[PDB]
Amino acid sequence: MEIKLIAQVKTVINAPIEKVWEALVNPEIIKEYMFGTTVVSDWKEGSQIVWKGEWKGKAYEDKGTILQFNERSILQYSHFSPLTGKPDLPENYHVVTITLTALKKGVEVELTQDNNETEKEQKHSEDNWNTMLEGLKKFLENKVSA
Numbered sequence: 001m002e003i004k005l006i007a008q009v010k011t012v013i014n015a016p017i018e019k020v021w022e023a024l025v026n027p028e029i030i031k032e033y034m035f036g037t038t039v040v041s042d043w044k045e046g047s048q049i050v051w052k053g054e055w056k057g058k059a060y061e062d063k064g065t066i067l068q069f070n071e072r073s074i075l076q077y078s079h080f081s082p083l084t085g086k087p088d089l090p091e092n093y094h095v096v097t098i099t100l101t102a103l104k105k106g107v108e109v110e111l112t113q114d115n116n117e118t119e120k121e122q123k124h125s126e127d128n129w130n131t132m133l134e135g136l137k138k139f140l141e142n143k144v145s146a
Contacts, residue, residue, distance in 0.1 A: 005116040007125040011133050014106040015140055021072050021100055023136065033135065045069035055083060067095060074099060091115070109133070 013020065023029050027039035038052040044066065051062045060082055067076035080093040094115035101108050111129050116122035 003114065005119060005122040007113040007116055007122045007129065008110065009126055009129050009133060010108065010110040011137065012106060013109055013137060013140065017072055017100060017102040017107055020107055020109070020140070023140070024075060024098060024100070033139070043069075049077070067097075072100070072102075 025041070025043050027041055030039050031037055039049070041047055041049050045068060047066045047069075049062075049064050049066070053060060062079070062081055064077055064079040067078055069075065074097075076095065076097045078093070078095045080090075084092055086092050092115075094113055097112050099108075099110045111133065113125055113129065116125060
């Protein structure tokens with residue numbers, strides 16, 4: 001036995017690293033996509049992060065920390081959702097790692113996620129993240145309307 005399936009996605013986006021990088025670590029922009037999520041962060045290595053929201057009338061809060069912080073290069077952070085209501089098992093969650101690079105034509109992006117129970121879950125995650133990436137591209141590429 002060993003590590004399970006890992007979800008990975010990537011798309012070619014034409015935009016400056018600053019703005020893309022900013023969109024990744026910003027409680028203000030991250031709020032634009034959300035209806036009214038209050039994200040709080042220090043934006044530095046080892047910084048704790050908490051999200052406020054409401055679920056089925058039951059208020060819940062997530063919790064994680066920055067695994068590593070490399071200015072305009074690499075960003076990694078651990079994440080845990082209490083909505084899981086699963087028995088005490090830290091291995092229940094996974095760590096997300098985002099890789100951003102500035103190329104001559106544009107900037108390449110990649111998002112990876114582990115701990116997938118099955119292909120169905122990996123696909124579900126892959127398709128989900130694709131939606132996020134697609135949603136990000138739709139907003140960023142919005143400048144076309146202007």
